[PDB]
Amino acid sequence: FFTIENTQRINLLRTGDEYATGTYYFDTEPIRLTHTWQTNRHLGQPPQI
């Protein structure tokens, strides 16, 4: 059982106040934007006609 008040620091913002999160930097692997059409049966060298 977790409680927000016990867990963390709370900022109190009135009308003149503003809050700014720091810069968070991701560590992640890029993802590929191009699809693959090539089946298991399209792999390798085709037979010779």
Place this chain on the structure above:
Amino acid sequence: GGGVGVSTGSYDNQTHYKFLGDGWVEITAYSTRMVHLNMPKSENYCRVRVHNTNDTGTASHMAMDDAHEQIWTPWSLVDANAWGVWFQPSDWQYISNNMIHINLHSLDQELFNVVIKTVTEQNTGAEAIKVYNNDLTAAMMVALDSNNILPYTPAIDNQETLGFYPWKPTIPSPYRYYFSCDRNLSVTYKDEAGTITDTMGLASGLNSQFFTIENTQRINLLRTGDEYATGTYYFDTEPIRLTHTWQTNRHLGQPPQITELPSSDTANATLTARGYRSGLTQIQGRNDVTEATRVRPAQVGFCQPHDNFETSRAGPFKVPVVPADITQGLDHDANGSLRYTYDKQHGQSWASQNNKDRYTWDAVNYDSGRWTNNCFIQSVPFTSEPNANQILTNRDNLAGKTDIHFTNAFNSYGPLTAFPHPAPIYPQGQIWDKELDLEHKPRLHTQAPFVCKNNAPGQLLVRLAPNLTDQYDPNSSNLSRIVTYGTFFWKGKLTLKAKMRPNATWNPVFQISATNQGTNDYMSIERWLPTATGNITNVPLLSRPVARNTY
């Protein structure tokens, strides 16, 4: 310098060894061939399809479907990748016997002494005679793909790689690659009433890729005095182990303690009664420890779906199966033993009348095999002496089918599974391969020991620049041109890293050794020697002779 009448290269096929320190060896393999290149049979690209109405039209023949779609090119590729190209049989023996692991380092390639000639016919009276003479001004196009833009197309798949014999000339493999036709095909058994769809789809706007050598790459023009040299390509790969593992899942860990040493050499030792034995097992509700049910660190090898055919848009295909030992059950398919078909250039024998020569490679690494008929699953809660209903035996029928058993569809692969990486094959084996561009990648490719992490070595493409007659109509459907062929030398250098094996064993290790003729064993030396007429045969050598301790 260079020019006509001055040769641009040298011929070195010999293999060298050098010892860098303790146990380390740098193996530098030179190989050289004379290559015979013919003018391409069509000057332009073609998109062709093979579709079997005869084979797949009849029911149940699905396994033999050849239907696909390919882009035929005028270009031809010089493919240096097989083990049989680089080494002679003795060098393979020396490496297989003495070294624990080996790894690829660099690859170099060169083309030199280009010679283009032309053919004329005369006088056609009586019998024609063909006159051959040089074109000194003719050229040959040469393009290397460094960036692997074009579809990667190993020639060894069809056994089209450069020949394995230094003194015989060899030919390039004509370059071609797949294209996506989206086949549809339906499943039937041997004699069945119904219809079979057996259709192929129209070209796809999403999936269609058409590549051209000229648009893609830079082409060098080589005349007789010119020579071409590939830079040094450096492999990034993981070494492979040259020593086989015998050690099964049931040989792992500490053996039980015997009560006492046997009295005589015939007598068997005895163990503490299984009721009183101390150990660790995952079976519940029974107080026993027995050598079969005790806990082992990991699973060695795994049961596999075998002779299963999965079908995506392309068509039905058999999924690969990792090579593993064939158990005494002799069953090859469940353990995925490779079977090669190859021609006289790469193998076979010049005396053989057959079109091809075929060999089944039964895997070494005796640890990972699976006897299929003796595998069984037992009901829970566990019981000794299960009645028929408490045990799953291979002999029983699955889904009411006679020859289909659970071991066909059963898959054991899991987190606890460990298996050795399969082994190279001296003739007909593929040295390296390119890794698929998918994000989630297989742990190993099945045929090739080495897989280039980032960028594979480039493909080397050659063709003869066309010789045109006096009359050339760019709009004509047919193109007349001067009959032309050429020859050139290919030279390459493959450096390796390897390490000598330590031997801690008392007894003699197994080794690859020639044997006298007249006994029928596989190693009879006659097979590595020429015949009277020069017929020579080159057969697969066993690899990994030396045993290893897994755990």
